[PDB]
Amino acid sequence: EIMRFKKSFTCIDMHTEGEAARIVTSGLPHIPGSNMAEKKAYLQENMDYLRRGIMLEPRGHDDMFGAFLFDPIEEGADLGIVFMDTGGYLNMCGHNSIAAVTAAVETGIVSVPAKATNVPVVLDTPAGLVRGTAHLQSGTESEVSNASIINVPSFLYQQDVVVVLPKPYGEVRVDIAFGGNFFAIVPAEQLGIDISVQNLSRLQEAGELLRTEINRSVKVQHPQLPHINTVDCVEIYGPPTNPEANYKNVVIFGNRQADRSPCGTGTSAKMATLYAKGQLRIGETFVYESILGSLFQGRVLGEERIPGVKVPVTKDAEEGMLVVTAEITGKAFIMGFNTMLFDPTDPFKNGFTLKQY
Amino acid sequence: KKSFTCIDMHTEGEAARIVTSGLPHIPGSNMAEKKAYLQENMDYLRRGIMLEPRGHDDMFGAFLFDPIEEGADLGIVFMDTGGYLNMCGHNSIAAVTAAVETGIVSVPAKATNVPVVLDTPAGLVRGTAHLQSGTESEVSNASIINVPSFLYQQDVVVVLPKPYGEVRVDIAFGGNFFAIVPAEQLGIDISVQNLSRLQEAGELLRTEINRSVKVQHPQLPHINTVDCVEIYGPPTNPEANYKNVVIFGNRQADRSPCGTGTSAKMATLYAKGQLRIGETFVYESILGSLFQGRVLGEERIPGVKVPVTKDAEEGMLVVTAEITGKAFIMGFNTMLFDPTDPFKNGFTLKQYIWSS
Ligand SMILES: *[C@H](C(=O)O)[C@@H]1CCCC1=O
Ligand SMILES: *[C@H](C(=O)O)[C@@H]1CCCC1=O
């Protein structure tokens, strides 16, 4: 029995509008690193089989997502966190950050002061500090109605980038923007495919293509964060189905996996792009719809121009790059408490996938 | 604010989410009625536990109940993402295993084998947990004696659209109905890379089959369609006799060798004199896992026949087949359902692919 639970992990399984967040709360040994990005590096280089065992079949599946919690390192942070999926490790994730804020408060990782209606929860992520706020349900001790995250600085990186793709797509114009991860943002109409669950496979294909061509043709580099230097996601957007939504989108990333949520980092990136182009005013509410009909809300809270520091879109005529502080709001639920087990003789203790390449 | 406890298992990669507590009270005077009740009035329980976000498109599981049938230790109803089912070889092995490892049935002092009898919608499934050398209750592997199995109809030729054309299958029962077909007949080599193609070929073949042949379980009217296609070929593992993948539901492949598929395969071979009683048959999966099997005996059912029963036989030939495999516990889970959670009953993004 003592030997059964050797190398086990404990998780709070959650979801944010259908998208998994497997939040691993214990089981890791000490992981060397002086910051969250280094701990993530250590995991990827030395312990990547853990991610595979926790994320993939049979304990997960090809669209599972999660995170390891750590003690916070940065000043003012409550919780350290490293995100993972079926392909690798993202520097940030909006839906998991929303889930983490929700879990922190619902399970007592962070104390709720008496008679409080909002509880802050600051996450120390590999992308930087993410300031969360849990909004409590009126008349409960610590039930969370929904959660806000103030993202790391977001920005438009390169505008009107043409990408050459095989038929039936061809030339597609995209923007490249940072919202925690680098996205390539492309309207669906430029792919010939409208956004629906029926067309998902065509979309997943279209966005694995587009993303490879991008990382071939276009070098990106976060100007304040050396370690962030590829386009991890493709955000395909179109007209809203929901009347409350400005737009619908699906984000394709990793092993051509599709995000079920409206995507928080993606929403930050979209809003930074709209804002840079004068199509969104500061404080205005922006609503993004998912493929499942769920909504995230967002607003741009502040702008800054960073002197002497430039990205491709920054004009010759301008001093510094424009960045924005974007808030994203959504709702997460606890769906289970799990103790995941790994028998040394389990031939699938490190998981498996039947997905091609 | 509902709450279920589960022992999450897998049998050589194939899920078995065994629900041990928290289910509502479900009527029925036998296990088939209990399953009928579940499917007509409580399908939301299955959907919540099997589908995303708590499960996924290839999740599989079972609800434990008090046994009803005399001699049984556990009542059980199986299910997957497509519906509730009557029998499941891999989940039976997992259930036997969990039953002994978590102390649902007793271990006699100094025993090396523990019987666990399951009361399923398809009848009694007599299982045995084989214990590891000197442990309180660590399970080495488990055997199940399937419900009676048989060849049903033989060398059925099937004209499929190209590139397939002519393919010959046998049809057999192992707790579920199967169409057994050589991979070679389809022109596809069995591998992970070819899974998509094998899943299509399974659908196409299955369709033409149910179109061109009606089938009937001559002891129960209702069980009357071929849902599963067992595609087999040369083994990769030298211990194995053959390799196979079972295609079922909606372009779903079984990750395990498939217990009921294995029983059906053995009934087939036996009827063709290709397998002896007591001989050990080893069947490999697409992931390289093995189940072992042995025909324990045969029987004739006087009066009763099926298309293969030759004129003069008086009764169809059935066999009793035993299947053995290993299941692992991969989690102790407590599944939660907020009444305000819009996905409390889960969702799937998987489409039925259809033309016109
Ligand atoms: C969505 C999000 O940030 O919520 C992103 C797209 C893929 C996973 C993500 O981090
Ligand atoms: C395999 C088995 O009996 O283990 C069956 C084929 C389809 C689903 C099953 O359970």
Residue numbers in the entry:
A (entry chain A): 38 to 394
B (entry chain B): 43 to 398
What text comes from the article?
Proline racemase of Trypanosoma cruzi (TcPRAC) is an enzyme present at all stages of the parasite life cycle, contributing to immune escape and persistence of the parasite in the host. Gene over-expression increases virulence, while knockdown appears lethal for T. cruzi. The structure also showed that TcPRAC crystallizes as a homodimer and bears a catalytic site on each subunit.
Compound 6 (NG-P27), bearing a five-membered ring (reminiscent of proline) was the most active derivative. The NG-P27 compound was co-crystallized with TcPRAC in the same conditions as the BrOxoPA complex. Continuous electron density was observed from residues 38–394 in chain A and 43 to 398 in chain B. Difference Fourier electron density maps indicate the presence of the inhibitor NG-P27 covalently bound to Cys300 in the active site of both polypeptide chains in the dimer. Electron density maps suggested possible multiple conformations of the cyclopentanone moiety of the inhibitor, but no attempt was made to refine alternative conformers and we describe here a single conformation of the ligand that best fits the electron density. The C2 atom of NG-P27 is covalently linked to the sulfur Sγ atom of the catalytic Cys300. In both monomers the inhibitor is very tightly packed, making numerous van der Waals contacts in the active site, and a hydrogen-bonding network stabilizes the carboxylate moiety of NG-P27 as observed for the TcPRAC/BrOxoPA complex. NG-P27, with prochiral substituents on C3, can form a second stereocenter. According to the crystallographic data, the 2S,3R configuration prevailed. Hence, the inhibitor, with C2 positioned si-face adjacent to Cys300, allowed nucleophilic addition (S) through to a mesomeric enolate intermediate. The apparent exponential kinetics constant (kobs) varied linearly with the concentration of OxoPA and NG-P27 as expected for an irreversible inhibition mechanism (inset). These results indicate that NG-P27 is a significantly more potent inhibitor than OxoPA.
